Structures are given as structure tokens and as C-alpha cells.
């Protein structure tokens, strides 16, 4: 059974869905591992490194994907309509595993049905304990949280840590993270590493203990409503307009003092909640920075634009696209392990084939298309 | 005539004190005595003692040498103070706990025209009740000059490594 | 008595030699403070903040510096030999205080001499405890050393700290700091606190303990030689090929494992020493980055180019100019404080006139020309 990892052809994508460690394990499972020439260059994984692990280097993309029974990829394959027909290169009746973007990109899903490809949308991994090692959103957003601080410090024209100097005391930068998810917790940790005073806020009640254990200080808003705000899958729900007004006023007291604002808040399925308005950024100090990690899902700030740095009211609003690709060389080996952890339980020991189990909710929650028909409860 | 002292001596001095101003310098960094110093600060605070840190602008071998190392040890920022904020408090301080610092405290800056460090503002540790200097020997600091504060009856020398000596003081306390 | 501060005209330079705090101090000493409009815009200092502090805003550079008994500036003035003539705007018999680069730029001194301008080259400040209140090298290098790590982390495709996640573990970034002065030491501190494994090396014997005082590992090459490496003023001597060969050999073992090499080594007057050869660049792993803070003095890695990030042998060699200007909002008030502390002891409180202590080591050591004669022994 052949497995193939191509190079990511989309603009700005430097990650790859393989690493030398993961190659060895696949070979151990009985796979024949093919990788496209120069695929890991952006993630600093050479061709020589992959061959040493025990893989074949195909020269072109087409040759890599021609005979491949299973295809591992980072982002969704491009179509003819997008000026590069990557879907055609995948073998008929094969199995795709990637960040498919299924709920926003139907044209690729229905293009994959036409070739009867059984695609597994890794972004839809169910929120269950045992699937933590298989979850690409979680592994990648963790690195994005770290990266938000580095971009913040790179755009900010003052230092982060407190330093008593003979030219004067340099004061610590005051960071405020909005949304203490996987990304938020790493942003706190990294900001606190660089010596910043760190504030944070979130709707879920359990995060207050997590902020405090990292040396952060939590901005409480309304303990009654925050108790009911967590869903079954352990994420936020719609808080309505009346909570937002109470939240904004409590936030403003610290936001006016804040130097770096890192917004990471997401509501799965729904658009991203507006946590910093245009009237709120006018009240901030000129020279401050806003990092909007939710920019591609509507933005927690409405002034943010995808792939751009908007300067307005003296404040830089940063909104880079594909933030985990900015940490490509750590993103890739963990993304590859997410795919490996997902796939390994379904491989036969002495059959040498892949048996994706319908009873297993990791498979049913992930599966968008199977053999020429859309199967997922969302979509159809 | 230096009044030398042990860890048990420094334990009694600060156990029976109301206010203590910690003065860290280059020697603390060399010994890497930050976590023991902050642990010592916790046991003082545990029994109601007022603790604060006094960071001299040129303390260490780089701007903000003490600040990064104290942040590593998780001292609260609201206990850390610049020279101009805290210098007044030495009058009301029972103890100036000088850990691996020297030129930072040297009154040859103010009293001695012929000194090379003359004119630099210093931390007025001498105005405290008892001045505790932790250092391995009678060797001078970077400027290469003697400190007259070593030779007076309100001062105790605590000869040893700054990590080991601070750990020994914490064990002498309870 | 009138003191004047212009906007920095050189490209990239966003700093300014003034702050609101230092304006009112100068006014208290009795000066009339003049400043060019928009001089502090890059350093987050509005004209209203300078006006509120007590300064006069002037429409142009010529109008601010016409009249102007003292001139404070950051970079050296543009000579006519570089086209635009800034020294022509300065009053005859005025006092100039800035970074002149006097040892490498004698023409600007000759130009300043031709208008009888008394010029104090602030980079020739003696490196002693008492002069630190007035040391522009120390305050600016410290921020430049901090910046190198932020810029290294920005250009580098992995995260600094080790991370132990559910998807797996990624190692820390490995940093090597060449030259452990003020900048080098703050780079170690900032890299170490971000979670990187930090190596370092230098010629001066005092360094080894200084590196170890920040939890870094010193790379020794020849301790019998480092004894004589330090001059009377604390600077490094020219070292010779015998040592240089042995350094490159000794540092090679760590440099092959290094992700981020931050090079800061300088020698007063002379071109910067080659610490990373072209052959050494070829042997570093792909995805590595070099930050060359010595780029403006020819570079420690001489493949670096001023104002440019160049990729050579798969290694991203960074060479930003005016690195403290990347932290312009903290850098500027520290620079203004240095110039205040230099000047304050020479001001007459009663008569409101400037009378310099000529025998003062601060003044004699830094003075380059006075009343149309080049005084400093280095330039005779
Ligand atoms: N901040 C900067 O930018 C910078 C840069 C360069 C120089 N400086 C200069 O350095 C000085 C800084 O003042 P400071 O008070 O911090 O340092 P200092 O005056 O040089 O004194 C350091 C003291 O620590 C002691 N020490 C060293 N290692 C020790 C150890 N492992 N355990 C216990 N004690 C140890 C030394 O005495 P023993 O040897 O007897 O133990 C020494 O007396 C100033 O003169 C300043 O101008 C500052
Ligand atoms: N399989 C598994 O077990 C998990 C996989 C991923 C995440 N898992 C857990 O879910 C939560 C949230 O993590 P995630 O990073 O997935 O959250 P999101 O990316 O959806 O959104 C980021 C945070 O943003 C918060 N949020 C969302 N909306 C708001 C508003 N309006 N104000 C303030 N904060 C808000 C929300 O509570 C989230 O914590 C955290 O405890 C994780 O350990 C668990
Ligand atoms: N008294 C005080 O408070 C001081 C405050 C700041 C600095 N002080 C002293 O000034 C001097 C010069 O410091 P700076 O940061 O200006 O050094 P440079 O910028 O000239 O150069 C950076 C480093 O580069 C090193 N260097 C220079 N050449 C080399 C070579 N060839 N290999 C390796 N390293 C080299 C050199 O030893 C320096 O440590 C040093 O002894 C400091 O302890 C003292």
C-alpha cells in the first residue's frame, strides 16, 4: 500500500504533511512512502533526510500522486477552477487526509466525489480526550499562540521586559490576550516568558485557573453567565449582545493601558465574535499593536484584513494569514504526527491494508466523502 | 577589622526585623542564587516581614541583569523598585540584604572626590539598621576600589557563595 | 540659551534625541528647547507632548537649528560630500552632541571644524560606572541585543522554547552569540528566557563568567591568549590569524548545530572581525539564520549586506541597519536622558549659561573638535 505526500502549492504555505520520524513509523506499519522533490524545504526537512528515513523521492507532483493509495496533505487540493488541478493528480478511489476546509469549500468536496476519493477532513476531529493527539487545529493553534507574541514584539517599537538602566527604567509591556484557548494559553506563556505583564479574559469558567497558574491575571466579567458558557465539546457558545456590553466595559479599563492585544477567540461554525470595536481601538495608545488570529474567520477586530497590517488610529492591526506556516518547521512534524496518530489504529498487522472503522467516532466525525457520495451530517 | 558572620547569625538578624530591602548585584548572577533569594523572600513574608528589591541602574554586567534573573525566579514586579523610588526607604529598613553587590553601594561615589566612581548615585544601604554583605572574599567589584561599608559596626560580612549562603540562611530560618 | 533637536533625516532612522521628560528638565536648567516638527513621530512622541512639556515646534530643520546654541542629534550630520548638507544648518560656534562615528568618519569632523562647531562624539564615552548615566552605546546596544533575538525568532521557522504536546515534542531553538558585550549579553538573556539553548563566545577573559551568569554556555578556544585580549578601556584588541583559525575550528562544532547565530563583535576604529566565514555559512543546517549587528562596520559574517536580508547557501543572513531604531519608542527617551546627563553638570544654574569642565574625562575623552581645531588625539 503506497502513501504519498506532495509539496504545498498554495501561496504562503511552507508546511508539509510528513517528517523523517513519521516516515520510519509508516515503513514500520508496511507502507511504501513517497514524497515530492523539495516538499519539506519550507519546513527545513530535506530530501536527503526523508530518504534516510526510508522514503522514495519523486521528481514531480503527478508522479508522486499517480499510484498513491492514501494521500497526506496539509491544505485542501486545488482544482482546475483555481488554476492548478491537484484533485486530478490523486488516484481514483484513493483516500485523502488533510485540512480540507469542508464546511467552507464545497467545490473541492464535490470535485473529490467525482473521482470517488474518500476524503477525511482533519479540522473536524471530534473534541474527545483520546483524539487530542490527532487534532490538527490544536497542534497548529498552539504554535500560532507563541507566534502571535513574536509578531507582536516585531511590530512593537518598545521592549517587552522590565529593565532598570542608567538611562532610565524601561517598563514592561502590558499584554492582553482575548480568548484563552490552546493559542491563548501559549500566548500568555510566551508573553510571560519575554517579561510582559499579562492580562487575559474568556467566557469559560475553567480558564481562570489556567491563566492564574501561568502568572496571568484574569479579567472577570460575570461569573453567573460564564458558568453556563461551555458546551459539551469544551468550547464557547453565543453570549448575546448584553454580555458583550458588560465585557467591553470591564476590558476597556485594561485595554487603554495595553500595549499588545492578542485576540484568539473562535465560536466553531459561527463567525468570530467582535471583541475589540473601532471605538475601542481609538481609546488605545498610539504605537500599540493588535494581533488578530481570528482574521480568517471574520476577525475579533473588524479593522483587521487577511494577509495585511492595517495602521489606523495610531494602532497596528496585524492579521497574517496561515499563522502556523510562520512556524513551519515545528508545525510540519506535529501535523505529520497528527495524521499518523489518526491513521495507525486502522492499519492491519498481517493484512497490509487500511480498515477505517465506522463504529469509531474519530472516522465518522472526520469523513466528508466516501466513494462518490457526501456522507457527513453537516453538508447533507 | 571586619565583623564576619555565619548563616545562623544572618538568620536571627532578619527573623527579628519588620522591613528588609534586598539589594542584588553581579555576584547573585554568577552564583545563580535567584530562586533561593526569592524563596528566602517568601519565608520572610510568611511571618509578616515587609520585603522589597532595590535594583541599581548599573547592577550586574548589562542593563537589566538583575531584572531578567529575578523574573526567572518569579518575584512579583510590584516588589521590584528603581533607585529613585526606594532610596528613601533605607532609613526605615531594619536590614539591607546586599546579595553579591558592591560598587552599587559604595559611598566613595559621594564622599571621596579622588574615587573613580565619584558622582554616580548609589543605594544608601548604610542608612539601614544592619547591612548584610554576601560575597566570597574581600575582593573589590568591577571598579577596582575598596568599600568602607565593610569596616563598620552596623555591617556584617557573610563570606561564601551567594547561592549556598542564601540556602544556608533559609535552612537556619524555619 | 537655545537648544535644538532636528528630525533624523537618514533613511530607516526613526529615533530622536529628545523626550517630553527631558524637555522640561532642560527648561528647568534654563534652556529654550526647540524641536523640528514631526521629529518624534517614529518614536511615538507627538508635537503636542513636546509642546506641553515646554518646547517650541519649528516648521523646518533650518529654522530649528539656525539660532541654536546647542544641537542634540542621534546620527551624524549629513555632509555635502554625501549631497545634502546638514552641518551647514548648524550655527557657528554652536555645540553639537551625537553619535559622530568620528574614528571611521573624519570628513564630518573636518566639515564641523570649518564652521567652528564644537562637536562631542558620544561613542567615545569612557566605559566606566559613573559615565553610564551618559552612555549612548550602552542604552542603544542593550536594545539592539534584545532586538536581534526578536528578529531571529521572527525569521526562524521553529519556536524558541521546547514544547511537549499531545501530538509530540519539538526541540528548543539553539542560539549562538558571537561577541558578549552589552548587546551580546541582552541577546543571551532574551534568548534564554524564551526557552532556547544558548551558547556564546568572546575574546575577553571576563566574558566566560558573564555568559555563565545568565545560564549560557561559554565556548572556550584558547584561555592562554584571552588574558591579554582586553584593552585598558574594556574593548577587544585585534586578535591575529593564529587565534582566528583556532576560534573558527573551536566554534564549528556548535555552529553546525546552531539555528540562530547572533553576531555583535566590534573593534573601535577598525573593521569588524570576520567570525563566520563563507565556508562556515555552507556548513550550517538549512533554515538557519544569522543576525549581523556588526553589518554597519563591514559585518562579522561578511556575506551580510546593510539594510538587506540575503539568503546564501540556504542560510538567511540578516543585516538590518539602525537596529535600535527598531525599538525607537524606548530607544529615543533613553538616548535623550544620556545627552541630558552628559550636559547637566556643565550648566550654570545662576547665569543660565553652558561652561564645560574641560579637564573632565567624560568631556576630554568625547570632544572631537572645538572653535575650529580638531582636539582629539585619535584624529591627529
Ligand atoms: N550593567 C552594566 O551595563 C555593566 C556592565 C559592565 C560593568 N558594570 C559595572 O559593574 C559593577 C556592578 O555593580 P555590582 O554591585 O552589581 O557588582 P560588583 O560591584 O562588581 O560586585 C560584585 C560582587 O559580587 C561578588 N561575587 C562574585 N561572584 C560571587 C559568587 N559566586 N558568590 C557570592 N558573591 C560573588 C564579588 O565579590 P567576591 O569576589 O569576593 O565574591 C563582588 O564584590 C559597577 O561598577 C558597574 O559600573 C555594569
Ligand atoms: N480533543 C480535545 O480534547 C480538545 C481539542 C482542542 C481543544 N480542546 C479544549 O477546548 C478548549 C478551547 O480550545 P480551542 O483552542 O479549540 O478554542 P477555540 O479555538 O474554539 O477558541 C478560543 C477561545 O476563545 C474563547 N471565546 C470564544 N468567544 C469568546 C468571547 N466572546 N469572549 C471571550 N472569549 C471567547 C473560547 O472560550 C475559547 O477558549 C480548551 O480548554 C482546550 O483544551 C480540547
Ligand atoms: N562600567 C560599566 O558600567 C560598563 C557599561 C557597559 C559596558 N562596559 C564595558 O565596555 C566594554 C565594551 O563593551 P561593548 O558592548 O561596546 O563591546 P563592543 O560593542 O566593542 O564589542 C562587542 C563584543 O565583541 C567582542 N569581540 C571583539 N572582537 C571579537 C572577536 N574577534 N571574537 C569574538 N569576540 C570579539 C568584544 O570582546 C566585545 O565584548 C566591555 O568591556 C564592557 O564590559 C562597562
Describe it for me?
Chain A has 380 residues and is α/β, with parallel strands linked by helices. Helix content of chain A is 32%, strand content 17%. Chain A has helices at 20-29, 47-53, 61-65, 86-89, 106-114, 136-155, 182-193, 207-213, 223-227, 240-255, 278-282, 328-343, 361-364; strands spanning 2-5, 32-36, 56-58, 70-75, 95-99, 118-121, 163-165, 168-170, 174-178, 197-201, 217-218, 260-263, 289-292, 308-312, 315-319. Chain B has 174 residues and is of the alpha/beta class. Chain B is built from 7 helices and 6 strands, in the order αβααβαβαβαββα. In chain B, strands 3-2-1-4-5-6 form a 6-stranded parallel sheet. The longest helix of chain B has 13 residues, at 34-46. Chains in contact: A-B, A-C, B-C. One 1,4,5,6-tetrahydronicotinamide adenine dinucleotide is lined by residues 127-129, 132, 137-138, 141, 178-184, 202-204, 234-236, 239, 264-267, 273, 275 of chain C.
Amino acid at each position: 500500500m503506497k502513501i504519498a505526500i506532495p509539496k504545498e502549492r498554495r501561496p504562503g504555505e511552507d508546511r508539509v504533511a510528513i517528517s523523517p520520524e513519521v516516515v520510519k513509523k509508516l515503513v514500520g506499519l508496511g507502507f511504501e512512502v513517497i514524497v515530492e522533490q523539495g516538499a519539506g524545504v519550507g519546513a527545513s526537512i530535506t530530501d536527503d533526510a526523508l530518504t534516510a528515513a526510508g522514503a522514495t523521492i519523486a521528481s514531480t507532483a503527478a508522479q508522486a500522486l499517480s499510484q498513491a493509495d492514501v494521500v497526506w496533505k496539509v491544505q485542501r487540493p486545488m482544482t482546475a477552477e483555481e488554476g492548478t488541478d491537484e484533485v486530478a493528480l490523486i488516484k481514483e478511489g484513493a483516500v485523502l487526509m488533510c485540512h480540507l476546509g469542508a464546511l467552507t469549500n464545497r467545490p473541492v468536496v464535490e470535485a473529490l466525489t467525482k473521482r470517488k476519493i474518500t476524503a477525511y477532513a482533519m479540522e473536524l476531529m471530534p473534541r474527545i480526550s483520546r483524539a487530542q493527539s490527532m487534532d490538527i487545529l490544536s497542534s497548529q493553534s498552539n504554535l500560532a499562540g507563541y507566534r502571535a507574541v513574536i509578531d507582536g514584539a516585531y511590530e512593537f517599537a518598545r521592549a517587552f521586559p522590565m529593565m532598570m538602566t542608567a538611562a532610565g527604567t524601561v517598563p514592561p509591556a502590558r499584554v492582553l490576550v482575548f480568548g484563552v484557548g490552546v493559542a491563548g494559553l501559549q500566548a500568555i506563556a510566551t508573553a510571560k516568558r519575554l517579561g510582559a505583564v499579562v492580562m487575559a479574559t474568556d467566557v469559560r469558567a475553567a480558564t481562570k485557573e489556567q491563566v492564574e497558574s501561568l502568572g496571568g491575571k484574569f479579567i472577570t466579567v460575570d461569573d453567573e453567565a460564564m458558568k453556563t458558557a461551555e458546551t459539551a465539546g469544551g468550547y464557547a457558545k453565543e453570549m448575546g449582545e448584553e454580555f458583550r456590553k458588560k465585557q467591553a466595559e470591564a476590558v476597556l479599563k485594561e485595554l487603554v493601558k495595553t500595549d499588545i492585544a492578542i485576540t484568539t477567540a473562535l465560536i466553531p461554525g459561527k463567525p468570530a465574535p467582535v471583541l475589540i470595536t473601532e471605538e475601542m481601538v481609538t481609546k488605545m495608545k498610539p504605537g500599540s499593536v493588535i494581533i488578530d488570529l481570528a482574521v480568517e474567520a471574520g476577525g475579533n477586530c473588524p479593522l483587521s484584513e487577511p494577509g495585511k497590517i492595517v495602521v489606523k488610529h495610531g494602532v497596528k492591526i496585524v492579521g497574517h494569514t496561515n499563522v502556523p506556516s510562520r512556524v513551519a518547521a515545528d508545525a510540519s512534524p506535529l501535523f505529520a504526527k497528527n495524521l499518523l496518530n489518526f491513521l495507525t489504529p486502522h492499519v492491519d498487522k498481517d493484512t497490509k491494508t487500511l480498515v477505517m472503522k465506522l463504529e469509531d467516532e474519530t472516522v465518522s466525525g472526520t469523513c466528508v466523502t466516501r466513494d462518490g457520495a457526501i456522507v457527513h451530517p453537516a453538508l447533507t | 577589622s571586619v565583623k564576619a558572620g555565619s548563616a545562623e547569625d544572618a538568620a536571627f538578624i532578619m527573623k527579628n526585623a519588620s522591613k528588609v530591602i534586598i539589594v542584588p548585584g553581579y555576584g547573585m548572577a554568577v552564583a545563580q542564587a535567584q530562586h533561593a533569594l526569592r524563596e528566602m523572600a517568601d519565608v520572610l513574608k510568611k511571618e509578616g516581614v515587609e520585603v522589597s528589591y532595590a535594583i541599581h541602574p548599573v547592577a550586574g554586567r548589562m542593563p537589566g541583569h538583575m531584572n531578567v534573573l529575578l523574573a526567572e525566579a518569579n518575584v512579583p514586579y510590584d516588589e521590584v523598585f528603581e533607585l529613585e523610588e526606594i532610596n528613601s526607604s533605607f532609613q526605615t529598613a531594619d536590614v539591607a540584604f546586599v546579595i553579591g553587590a558592591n560598587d552599587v553601594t559604595n559611598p566613595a561615589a559621594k564622599t571621596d572626590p579622588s574615587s573613580p566612581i565619584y558622582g554616580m548615585p548609589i543605594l544608601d544601604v548604610e542608612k539601614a539598621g544592619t547591612v548584610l554583605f554576601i560575597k566570597r572574599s574581600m575582593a573589590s567589584g568591577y571598579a577596582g576600589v575598596e568599600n568602607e561599608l565593610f569596616f563598620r559596626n552596623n555591617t556584617m560580612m557573610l563570606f561564601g557563595d551567594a547561592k549556598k549562603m542564601t540556602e544556608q540562611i533559609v535552612q537556619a530560618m524555619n
